[PDB]
Amino acid sequence: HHMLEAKFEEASLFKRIIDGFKDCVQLVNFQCKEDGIIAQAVDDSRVLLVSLEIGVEAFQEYRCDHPVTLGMDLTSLSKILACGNNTDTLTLIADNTPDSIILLFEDTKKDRIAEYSLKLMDIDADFLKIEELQYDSTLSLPSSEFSKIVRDLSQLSDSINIMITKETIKFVADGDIGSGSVIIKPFVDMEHPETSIKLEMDQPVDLTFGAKYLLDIIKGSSLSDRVGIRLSSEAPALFQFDLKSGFLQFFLAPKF
Amino acid sequence: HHMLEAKFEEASLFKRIIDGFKDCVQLVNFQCKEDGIIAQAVDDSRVLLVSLEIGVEAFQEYRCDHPVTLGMDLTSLSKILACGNNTDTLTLIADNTPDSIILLFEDTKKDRIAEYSLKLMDIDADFLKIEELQYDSTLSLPSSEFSKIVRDLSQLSDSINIMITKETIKFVADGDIGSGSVIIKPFVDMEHPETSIKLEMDQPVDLTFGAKYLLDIIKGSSLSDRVGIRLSSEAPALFQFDLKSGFLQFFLAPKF
Amino acid sequence: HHMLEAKFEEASLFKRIIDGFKDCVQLVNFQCKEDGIIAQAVDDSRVLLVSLEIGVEAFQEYRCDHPVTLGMDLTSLSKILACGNNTDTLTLIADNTPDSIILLFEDTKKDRIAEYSLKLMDIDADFLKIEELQYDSTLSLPSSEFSKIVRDLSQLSDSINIMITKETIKFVADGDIGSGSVIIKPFVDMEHPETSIKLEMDQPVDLTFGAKYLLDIIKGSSLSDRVGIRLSSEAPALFQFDLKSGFLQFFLAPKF
């Protein structure tokens, strides 16, 4: 015992994971299984889904005797998760049929220990599996560039339109003061693989998304310096920031 | 074609020019002429005039077939002008009888292009020529010091008084909590010409200015590390921050 | 003359002293005596007392012909004390039966002088002497760690409980979202004396304090990288940040 004990070497990883999506959802259902953690959250309007996978390899110690679903409020969780040092050892702890989850920050010298208890919510766990097999288009680019594009075009419009034609990625915003149009071209840079812009287009796309939601999605930069985007004319877009053993995904419904 | 094409090597220059005076005026009339750009703006209360000159030498490419007057709202313009990278190539573009102006940010590698359109205002262009031949006093000092003096004395009073006697520059503020008085002495420092404080006094002066307006005027520091001030008992004061090929001027009316 | 002339080599020291406690009191009575300065302030609810001592050795020049009591408003004083450069020479100046105190910032090169006048308040000077001879417990630790503990646990509760048992220091907060418990262990580190955590316990203690007030008390970090805490079951706790020739003390009443 206890039933669940998940020990990150550095609290920084989980701090950043929660930074990745704390601003766009109020409630989150974590599910800790023998093979690692997954989590889902949806916003008030059911246009944004957050899906998280943390494999067992991301922990320095992991044990979960039985799957549990832990419902948490993001304000409470983020407050508590701000209490660590980035280099502290962090341990999620839970018992059978838990009323709360324990977060244990431990010093690297063993001088101090900060133990926090977080009351859990009751949340009916209706996990969605909306990821498609094929998407019309797939691209990947540096997350900082995605952030710059989104933050720029957000000043002009509530809505940002992503258009993909062969060898051409285009972001557009139209508003009262004016309009903006960023055109980026795919290229593989061998001197700096991290700057590359990659595109695979089985079918061209023209989709519109709420700027409010893209502004939250770009906060996945805290986890990865690149972002993958999968776009479908019939389904939500998928924005993915990889971990070394997992990922953070945002599924965002286009505007009709 | 087009009629007007003005290409800054770095968007940073125009970004800073607009930072210099975006906070003190809502509307601005630019006038692009064969020999460069000038611009004017006045505030709601007609106590502050902003006058800008950008010579042809400040651009890496400049062409303007015919003079045009472009009325712009500062909020819109500043929003759009925040969208560039500082090292991007920036190009103002306009056509005959334009309804909008285009701002084109281009990558140094040609990977991406951000094109923005800004709707223009209708503004009757009544350009003022209020600069005097002789001013009672003329001084110059490091813009950071001007900013420190103004920001300090602004905490004590709505009004800051500039007094000039021979070899003595003095700033004063009187208020409820108390009063403050900064006295600076002219000196030419050869080890650091940029720190010098220079004064020419044909007649002593004693003028009062609204602190709210000096607080905006000091934002011309983004363009030059020195500021020139010309003071007249009968006319608005002139605060000037030079460019390598132009200048930014603020004419501020004294309080009666 | 004048009667009082107290000259700090760097305005930074007094700037930091006032930063130490400007946020927790509105009015302050300074008392300048032949042997240095002391000061007291109490908050609206008479749960927090601020006590300051600045010995003559902390000044580069000090002269006070006769004790004076100077009542000052913290907003006014802090505004004026923000007007200096950290390396300016600062001089407090007062005359017999003063209506105001003068603060004189002087350049190290003698180029400029900023002279400020601060109107004084009328405050009946009822100085308290509530410090005890013996306290149940006494500890000391790095002020940054005290700040981290307080800022963390403040997110969870209005109240923070300090428990001291032999060789164990414990901070606790209980709230709606959950609870937190930091346990620190005394240790003397010879490689870094500044990181040590020292404890002397004549009797164990269990005291509760308003988080709002601890959040202000931790701002004494601007004066010292260590904090001493003296805890009594019958009296206010004493939080002390030392100067090289004086100290800043906060006496905080426990919650019944």
From Swiss-Prot, chains A, B, C:
**Covalent cross-link Glycyl lysine isopeptide (Lys-Gly) (interchain with G-Cter in SUMO), where:** K129, K166
Q: Which GO terms describe its cellular component?
A: chromosome, telomeric region; nucleus; PCNA complex; replication fork
Q: What does the UniProt entry say about where the protein is found?
A: Nucleus
Q: Name one GO biological process term.
A: meiotic mismatch repair
- Cite the location of the cross-link Glycyl lysine isopeptide (Lys-Gly) (interchain with G-Cter in ubiquitin) from the record: K166
Entry-linked Gene3D superfamilies: DNA Polymerase III, subunit A, domain 2
Q: Which UniProt keywords apply?
A: DNA damage, DNA repair, DNA replication, DNA-binding, Isopeptide bond, Nucleus, Ubl conjugation
* DNA-binding region (UniProt annotation): 63-82
List, alphabetically, the InterPro entries matched.
DNA_clamp_sf, Pr_cel_nuc_antig, Pr_cel_nuc_antig_C, Pr_cel_nuc_antig_CS, Pr_cel_nuc_antig_N
Task: Tell me the subunit arrangement.
Answer: Homotrimer. Interacts with RAD30. Interacts with MCM10. Interacts with UBP10.
| NCBIfam families per the UniProt record, alphabetical | pcna
Role summary: This protein is an auxiliary protein of DNA polymerase delta and is involved in the control of eukaryotic DNA replication by increasing the polymerase's processibility during elongation of the leading strand. Involved in DNA repair.
Q: Which HAMAP family does the record associate with it?
A: DNApol_clamp_arch (MF_00317)
The molecule here is called: Proliferating cell nuclear antigen
Q: What is the lineage of its organism?
A: Eukaryota, Fungi, Dikarya, Ascomycota, Saccharomycotina
- Name of the gene this protein is made from: POL30
